[PDB]
Write a protein that holds these residues in place. Structure first.
Motif, PDB file in Angstrom:
ATOM      1  N   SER B  55       0.803  -1.209   0.000  1.00  0.00           N
ATOM      2  CA  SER B  55       0.000   0.000   0.000  1.00  0.00           C
ATOM      3  C   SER B  55       0.839   1.263   0.000  1.00  0.00           C
ATOM      4  CB  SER B  55      -0.904  -0.006   1.216  1.00  0.00           C
ATOM      5  OG  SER B  55      -1.706   1.136   1.256  1.00  0.00           O
ATOM      6  N   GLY B  56       0.719   2.020  -1.080  1.00  0.00           N
ATOM      7  CA  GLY B  56       1.442   3.270  -1.269  1.00  0.00           C
ATOM      8  C   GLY B  56       0.560   4.441  -0.856  1.00  0.00           C
ATOM      9  N   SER B  57       1.156   5.538  -0.369  1.00  0.00           N
ATOM     10  CA  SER B  57       0.347   6.714  -0.028  1.00  0.00           C
ATOM     11  C   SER B  57       1.080   8.064  -0.079  1.00  0.00           C
ATOM     12  CB  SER B  57      -0.249   6.531   1.346  1.00  0.00           C
ATOM     13  OG  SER B  57      -0.967   7.661   1.720  1.00  0.00           O
ATOM     14  N   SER B  58       0.491   9.030  -0.781  1.00  0.00           N
ATOM     15  CA  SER B  58       1.062  10.379  -0.917  1.00  0.00           C
ATOM     16  C   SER B  58       0.170  11.431  -0.300  1.00  0.00           C
ATOM     17  CB  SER B  58       1.281  10.699  -2.366  1.00  0.00           C
ATOM     18  OG  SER B  58       1.697  12.028  -2.553  1.00  0.00           O
ATOM     19  N   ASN B  59       0.693  12.149   0.700  1.00  0.00           N
ATOM     20  CA  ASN B  59      -0.096  13.151   1.425  1.00  0.00           C
ATOM     21  C   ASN B  59       0.192  14.578   0.937  1.00  0.00           C
ATOM     22  OD1 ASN B  59      -1.307  14.998   3.297  1.00  0.00           O
ATOM     23  ND2 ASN B  59      -1.255  13.417   4.888  1.00  0.00           N
ATOM     24  N   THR B  60      -0.803  15.184   0.294  1.00  0.00           N
ATOM     25  CA  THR B  60      -0.702  16.486  -0.355  1.00  0.00           C
ATOM     26  C   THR B  60      -0.326  17.605   0.593  1.00  0.00           C
ATOM     27  OG1 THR B  60      -1.825  17.849  -2.019  1.00  0.00           O
ATOM     28  CG2 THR B  60      -3.058  17.476  -0.006  1.00  0.00           C
ATOM     29  N   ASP B  61      -0.642  17.434   1.871  1.00  0.00           N
ATOM     30  CA  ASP B  61      -0.419  18.464   2.864  1.00  0.00           C
ATOM     31  C   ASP B  61       0.923  18.352   3.549  1.00  0.00           C
ATOM     32  OD1 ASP B  61      -3.014  19.779   2.682  1.00  0.00           O
ATOM     33  OD2 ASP B  61      -3.856  18.163   3.759  1.00  0.00           O
ATOM     34  N   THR B  62       1.751  17.377   3.139  1.00  0.00           N
ATOM     35  CA  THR B  62       3.056  17.257   3.752  1.00  0.00           C
ATOM     36  C   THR B  62       4.095  17.136   2.659  1.00  0.00           C
ATOM     37  OG1 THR B  62       3.106  14.835   3.815  1.00  0.00           O
ATOM     38  CG2 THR B  62       1.983  15.955   5.607  1.00  0.00           C
ATOM     39  N   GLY B  63       3.666  16.620   1.499  1.00  0.00           N
ATOM     40  CA  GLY B  63       4.537  16.352   0.353  1.00  0.00           C
ATOM     41  C   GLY B  63       5.272  15.014   0.482  1.00  0.00           C
TER      42      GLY B  63
END
Lengths: 294, 294, 294, 294, 294, 294
Positions: B55-63
């Protein structure tokens, strides 16, 4: 048995929308009076399923004469209503309503407006759900540097009502208005209290008194001050084709009015407002309206 | 007839664990939305009895871009599950679960974690017992200057539920958290109310409305003040391979989302959050997720 | 006998709409040629009452490749047609047509279009009435700072035709275009003459010559000058699954083309244009199109 | 008789696509060998009309282990195939193919790919037409600062083949590749010769020798020099569930391989490559693959 | 039918190896003569599949008496031959040969040698492929500061032969020897010509003359000079158990010899060399050999 | 009755060699564990009387991958075994063993090794005699500036054992090592104590506990100090095709392992070592081995 996508009873186990809270009291104070204006309402229908309505209006305090014309098509077999509209300010538009097509108790409406005076185009999408003891929905206003979201809900139990209404501005992502209300309703009377943004407060009382007599009381006040406003109104059925109404505001403003059915389908309304106690030495106003339905 | 070391019926005469109270309402509000993140879930299996999940995950609010990888081995003939896990923060570990090996309805799990970033080692031992009308258990957290003990139990009768959850700190020999809850459940709806430490209160409503429509309401408030929070959400099955969802928070926050099956085994989810009424002039957020199962 | 809300005979005692005047001559000059473009037309149908159509197009003089996709639903039992459409410029829309639902010979169509490239929304409402010896109607174009009104009517007697077409701009309350036409039609030939705004004049001749041969002549001229334009065209059925066509313009432009049915349902068209007398030392153009109907 | 939008015979009066020229010779040299890799192919189907395929691969010369998973849905009644795909590099996508829906012999395919590693989106549109003695088509590659156009056609007569392939870059409006080929085919043998851009030349021979023996020869050379390359290969059916293959390159590279059916539906392949004459004192390579179809 | 990994006919459609070119002529000049030496060859076999061979030798020109002993095991069911060997210089070793185990016509041999006189270990790996009209292979010599690569191939058509032999030194990455040859062979005669490194040239003629008579001619010369060498030889079968042979060298060297079978399995050979014309007043040499096979 | 050159009973009235004293306890501590390495053992046999064995090994603490290959020939009718061996360090050799050929109970072995890495040649001659209540022998190591003589003997009575082992260096004519041991053995348990050179002391206990459980204890200490070492180990047969083992060292080192028969002839072993109490924050090691016998 037809399947259901939602369930509801017959009225009135389904509450009024937020906007309808206090409507009965409001009608006593509003209907039957037309001070300062002359109004002309012609309504016709055709067996083809089309209704027409034209409304003229002259405002004594501006000298302007205006009006609106609408055509409505009712697709009774589909639950669809299509409306075409035009007015004197050259605003034109189309409205499409959908009822019980998606699920029972659901109403969806699309409102598109254009004004060649500027070339501006704008519109609204409305959604409203009616179910046992709940009436909820939302209007979304699509315009330049919008949309605005206007949500609401009313719920109740054993005659008791409560609800809210909120307006948000999506261009800011902020709440701009938050209204709340409580009340009670039955066949004989209705009681309502509300608040707008924690500052403006008020309420109303609706009461059936006699078979021919409908009365009401309005209350209002503003937070931070001692200013209160109020008034009392009534409507009396004089006979099957005639009625009188009157209202008195705490600011000594007395409204009067009379409606008479001239012929079934034809109604004439006269009204006036007097500025007490300086009468006739003040802002006296009169009104006249005639409505004909074919 | 096999002997028993404990007895239980089939679900649902066995209640949810404390943690599962209100799960159906929670899923309507949580599942289908991924605002602010991009997620990638790849799941595969092999006939050797091993399942893999990444499971991959990218958080827009932290980069920050993160992820976890797990391998699971299922010893179906023993009731044993063995899991190996790693993630991007270099945390690694092993989990071993035991089901119905000791007695029926008993689940025992051992969770050991290590992080070379500090060299820290820690873990948990979990125990859960399922029986007619009771679901009880305890998680013990073993760490530096611990352990902590997290106990719970739910019980019920004729659709009614009640239970508790408590956390103790053995390094102090004190209770640090004491939660309670009550409710009701059936196939069509669920009602839940709870309290955390006598200060935080709340609850939820889950309701089936139509065959294709799942709705819910969340409530919350804090003791000592007049602050209340709430929201309404729904999920609608558009077709066998598509659905839409939305939710509105009292703070004028409107979530929307859409899921589509692209191919059996392949699902795509899009979502967004708007800050009313200041839209688009506020903290607008979007999300995207793709899941593939082999 | 069913009642009537309007009466009409079978074609051709009902005249063509203004737009259809001269259509037969025009088809000889237009159909069968595709100079400068490659076109691909795939049409399919399903027994569920839905027709699909996709049309690809490549323009040699721009290098652009475009196309449109449409889905049509035919409610044969209602007289209603519903169309969904999309194209490569990201323009999308919906069209709803009503035939003989209101009264016999009446056709009503609603056309709504949206383009996310700008967010612009616009549309048209069309109305057309067919009756013995009269074909009348009007298209109203609703747009920013519109609407425009496009009215027309054709009437006739014993093969003779006459009619008009007018465009008005409601934002000005002025006529912007006023076209007139006269003519004669029978099975073997058609004669048409027209004028646009009193300045542009022209006409055409359609003539059946042989069972396998369709010919025509186009004429045009402009008021205030001595400039005239003309051309001659023909279509010849070579065999049941093949045909040739050609046309010559007064400006020495010679068009040629050939169509062949490859299989029933499958048609291939090739064409070219030569700039006389400087050939091949000028703007030579070629075209190709393939159409498949399932 | 169904109508036709295009006509064609049954194979093999319809030629191979440009890409398929020489395929039989190529399969002898390519199939049955997997030097340097370990491959795992699991294929399954369900009666619901869905096929699944998962392919694992380990490359000895990089140490990387990769793979792809696909799901395919076959709408046999429509001529439509829908494919969902994912791989280890986190590339995901959708493919939609249309066969004989537009006209007979026409195949249209839409290929859309996305990679979250960069967020890049790209795709291809393919079109291929099969008819008596002609096989023509074009792939258009849509990407950043593209598209590229890849056109081709093969035609033939009495076993003789000829054709071309061209790639254009629309961002330049230039041809970047122009390939040509000629050949001959029958049941027993095939002969092919080709050229790429006027510089790279080559060809191949396919020959059936015995019922259990398939052999071939590859040739290649480069314009401007005396460098030539070649090789010979063969495949021998040892028994109904076993075969051997081998090939020798002019550079003294000898490939060997063996395939055995273990059970119907289950096939095991082993292979190796030796660098002559320095063996085993050179770049010896081995391969292994197992395929299971359910 | 057994599968094949390679194909070949029966001899003699398969050519001789490079080393075997001219063998028949060479045997007439070499076999039957033993000038200067006394040789003793004892060969035995056992029904267990083991063959033994011991060869003694005394050289008159050195006074040294030497010999070799070998044991060979034949795994007829596997195509494997295992040989153990020892000699008087204390050199010992093992040889393993593989025939038709990999593919038909393929022979692989491993030769490992050790000498305690120095402790040196070295060996060779040989590979040879026999197919229709081709005989190719390579010996790789593994030693201190080696290996050396000795490649070769012979090919032919309708009795005609041609081929090459090359030796490379991998410690230098250079060719050190490049031999070429051409010729013709049939049952009655063989013709061979060759060159070594472009400097040494020669050839031979083999001819059957009579049923009991085999004759041959050898030729040689060196580039850059006028030096030529030659000789003529013959072998005559005197009776079924006796033969005579002789040869004359251009340098006036005349060899003679006689072989007699004493008993089947037992053969006695005598020979001598005379230095003409100075006889007996020159380097007269005699030889004797006895061979016994059980 | 065959004559005898020596007499002995069947085991176990014949004692273990010095090297075998304590073997049962040692196997519990050694077998089943492979920490830090990956091992691969392939064994095959042929009906011709030849056994083959190949053993691969990868050491995690060096990164080196090594291995050995052996071929053994068993002359069952002679009592002779011939072994050929090679390994990755390029060491090669031959071993010849003789059993009961000279006299009963006598075993003689010749071991010759060569390493081309240096050209070094060396070897050993071993002799061992088994008789009632005595097991004696000697290994002589022949090398540069050697030989070394390694003598030993064990004797016993009624389960009691005693013996010695001595190493001498003939290039010095001195004893370099003198080991002694005592003990007791039966079917259920074994007790052993020993000393090396009067300085290193130790011993072990082997005990059968249950039918499926084998346990042991190791002891050691060094003269002149207070340093002692010890550990406890066990092996448990989980089922006919599975077992577990573990061991604990006084230095807080805990070994674990598991072996499973996958198929008769196929065995898989996994193991690990943990450095207590700092786990996982220390020198954690894992191992893997697979053995296949044909």
């Amino acid at each position: 048995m037809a399947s259901y996508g939602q369930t509801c009873p017959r009225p009135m186990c389904i509450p009024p929308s937020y906007a309808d809270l206090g409507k009965a009291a409001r009608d006593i104070f509003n209907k039957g009076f037309g001070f300062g204006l002359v109004k002309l309402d012609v309504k016709t229908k055709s067996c083809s399923g089309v209704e027409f309505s034209t409304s003229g209006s002259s405002n004594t305090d501006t000298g302007k004469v205006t009006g609106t014309l609408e055509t409505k098509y009712k697709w009774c077999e589909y639950g669809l209503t299509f409306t075409e509209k035009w007015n004197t300010d050259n605003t034109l538009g189309t409205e499409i309503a959908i009822e019980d097509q998606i699920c029972q108790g659901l109403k969806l409406t699309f409102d598109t407006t254009f004004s060649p005076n500027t070339g501006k185009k704008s519109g609204k999408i409305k959604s409203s759900y009616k179910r046992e003891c709940v009436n909820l929905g939302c209007d979304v206003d699509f315009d330049f540097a919008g949309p605005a979201i206007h949500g609401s809900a009313v719920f109740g139990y054993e005659g008791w009502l409560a609800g809210y209404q909120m307006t948000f501005d999506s261009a800011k992502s902020k709440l701009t208005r938050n209204n709340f209300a409580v009340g009670y309703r039955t066949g004989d009377f209705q009681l309502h209290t509300n608040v707008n943004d924690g500052t403006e407060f008020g309420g109303s009382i609706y009461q059936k008194v006699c078979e021919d007599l409908d009365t009401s009381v309005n209350l209002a006040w503003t937070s931070g001050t001692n200013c209160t406003r109020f008034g009392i109104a009534a409507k009396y059925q004089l006979d099957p084709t005639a009625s009188i109404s009157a209202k008195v505001n705490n600011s000594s403003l007395i409204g009067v009015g009379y409606t008479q059915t001239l012929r079934p389908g034809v109604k004439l309304t006269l009204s006036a407002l007097v500025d007490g106690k300086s009468i006739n030495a003040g802002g006296h106003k009169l009104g006249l309206a005639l409505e004909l339905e074919a």
